[PDB]
DNA sequence: CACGGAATCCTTCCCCC
DNA sequence: GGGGGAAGGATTCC
């Protein structure tokens, strides 16, 4: 069983470099401007020249400028990156019929058929890196191992622009050596709950009564970790299908007035519909971000699909429902469409 | 200062043989 | 008791 994971390097910034090579070499910051004020917002990503100084995904744009006042700051252009992603995905297709697109810049390939051993797998890796660099002029990192999880881990260890195989002898040392927090699907909240249980390495999950683990982190999560420890994890590669479309925007000023929010809300639905393109949702959820950055949501499923008129109508009630049950002001508002026919 | 988007799981109902 | 779902939220990752 051989899985090959591909992850494009500093993707949004690298695409910006390709479309305008003059940028290459200098610090490049792709930002998301919220408009609340001059430079309000966050950094989507940054090229390496910028990450070596602390500027990275998540930090406020205002904070990134204090560190690199002279870098190049660019607004994020999803559509552009998405189409480039799509083309790159189509290059991988020509390497396996078994392909799972995980995000806008990640994909897993089941090359158990094609390749025979790890040596060949590695070479196929180089062929893919090479192909993509030539066609799209974009570098990516490749990770190869026994299953998806370790393939991805392989990639995190080899970036940027690397390629790495984590052979069976290593999996075993990683299950013992590797820090549980560096395992995909284990964020802060979980790692923290894991420390208390004395688990700092994948192996520790075997020296704990399952039921206490489940109690603390959930069954799904407990079975996941345990199978990994037992070197038994092996979920297949499957094409994922879009299960929900939505849009959320920041208002210029926090508000509680329905008439002040409606406009932002309607625009959100509009864009969402354009994005649905042919798809018809049965469920609609209204999502609100409270002034103290907490998230509130109210939704509804219908026994049939939702027309745009219906969406406008029903979204106002859920927004009214929200305000009636929460007293904080609202900072961000949006909609989520799901359960496609 | 803290954006925008989406999947998946966890709980708590709630209806009902 | 337990199947079946819908809601609202928790949690992770891009
Ligand atoms: N708006 C927004 N976009 C994000 C955020 N995090 C990631 N993205 C984008 C950043 C990247 O361009 C793309 C994800 O790839 P990461 O897996 O994020 O890789 P990135 O390419 O930035 O890092 P790397 O290639 O490993 O050096 O998704 C975020 O918090 N907000
Ligand atoms: Ca990644
Ligand atoms: Ca990446
Ligand atoms: Ca982590």
């Amino acid at each position: 069983m051989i899985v090959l994971f591909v992850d494009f390097d500093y993707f949004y910034a690298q695409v910006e470099e390709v479309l305008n090579p003059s940028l290459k070499g200098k610090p490049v910051v792709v930002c998301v401007f919220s408009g609340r004020f001059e430079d309000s917002g966050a950094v989507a990503t940054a090229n390496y020249e910028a990450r070596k100084f602390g500027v990275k995904a998540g930090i406020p744009i205002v904070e990134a400028k204090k560190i690199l006042p002279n870098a190049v700051y660019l607004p994020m252009r999803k559509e552009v990156y998405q189409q480039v992603s799509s083309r790159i995905m189509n290059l991988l297709r020509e390497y396996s019929e078994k392909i799972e697109i995980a995000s806008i810049d990640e994909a897993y390939l089941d090359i158990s058929d094609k390749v025979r051993d790890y040596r060949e797998a590695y070479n196929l890796g180089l062929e893919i890196k090479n192909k993509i660099l030539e066609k799209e002029k974009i570098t990516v990192t490749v990770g190869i191992s026994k299953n998806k999880v370790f393939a991805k881990i392989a990639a995190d260890m080899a970036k940027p622009n690397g390629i790495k195989v984590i052979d069976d002898e290593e999996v075993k040392r990683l299950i013992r050596e590797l820090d549980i927090a560096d395992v995909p699907g284990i964020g802060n909240i979980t790692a923290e709950k894991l420390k208390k249980l004395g688990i700092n390495k994948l192996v520790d999950t075997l020296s704990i009564e399952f039921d206490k683990l489940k109690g603390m982190i959930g069954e799904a999560k407990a079975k996941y970790l345990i199978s990994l420890a037992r070197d038994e994890y092996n979920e297949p590669i499957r094409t994922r299908v879009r299960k929900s479309i939505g849009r959320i925007v920041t208002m210029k000023r926090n508000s509680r007035n329905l008439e002040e929010i409606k406009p932002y809300l309607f625009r959100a639905i509009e864009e969402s519909y354009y994005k649905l393109d042919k798809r018809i949702p049965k469920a609609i959820h209204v999502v609100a971000v409270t002034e103290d950055l907490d998230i509130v949501s109210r939704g509804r499923t219908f026994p049939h699909g939702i027309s745009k008129e219906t969406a406008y109508s029903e979204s106002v009630k859920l927004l009214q429902k929200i305000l009636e049950e929460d007293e904080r002001k609202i900072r961000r508002i949006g909609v989520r469409f799901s359960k496609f026919i």
Side-chain angles (χ1 to χ4, degrees), chain A residues 102-238:
Chain A
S103 65
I104 186 168
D105 77 338
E106 294 173 359
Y108 294 94
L109 287 179
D110 180 350
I111 61 179
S112 293
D113 294 298
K114 318 304 175 300
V115 166
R116 286 200 299 172
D117 62 294
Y118 279 135
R119 161 185 156 288
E120 280 168 47
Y122 186 93
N123 288 171
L124 188 51
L126 303 198
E127 175 173 350
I128 286 180
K129 285 166 61 69
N130 239 282
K131 172 79 73 161
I132 301 175
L133 178 50
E134 172 185 352
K135 303 291 178 179
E136 291 304 330
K137 290 181 186 299
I138 277 178
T139 79
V140 312
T141 290
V142 169
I144 297 165
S145 202
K146 161 200 283 62
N147 55 39
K148 289 185 292 182
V149 173
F150 284 103
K152 177 171 179 60
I153 292 178
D156 296 335
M157 292 174 77
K159 75 217 311 183
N161 177 47
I163 177 172
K164 178 176 189 61
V165 168
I166 290 185
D167 64 47
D168 303 51
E169 170 174 56
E170 184 163 58
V171 174
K172 299 185 178 179
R173 57 184 259 59
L174 284 180
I175 295 184
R176 214 187 312 306
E177 218 80 57
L178 197 261
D179 173 46
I180 205 76
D182 290 307
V183 173
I186 306 299
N188 297 153
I189 291 170
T190 299
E192 201 63 311
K193 294 173 193 169
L194 288 178
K195 242 79 177 60
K196 287 191 287 297
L197 300 180
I199 304 183
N200 317 73
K201 315 282 188 176
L202 269 175
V203 70
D204 308 354
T205 79
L206 299 182
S207 70
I208 297 288
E209 294 300 280
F210 174 77
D211 259 45
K212 189 190 178 186
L213 191 59
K214 159 188 283 197
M216 191 72 176
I217 71 175
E219 174 161 67
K221 193 78 69 181
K223 289 182 182 174
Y224 168 73
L225 290 183
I226 293 178
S227 55
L228 279 174
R230 283 171 165 161
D231 190 341
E232 309 188 10
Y233 173 90
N234 178 47
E235 299 308 293
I237 281 54
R238 350 73 69 184

Side-chain angles (χ1 to χ4, degrees), chain A residues 273 306-314:
Chain A
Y273 261 80
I306 314 181
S307 73
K308 199 197 291 173
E309 254 63 41
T310 296
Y312 278 117
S313 182
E314 186 63 15

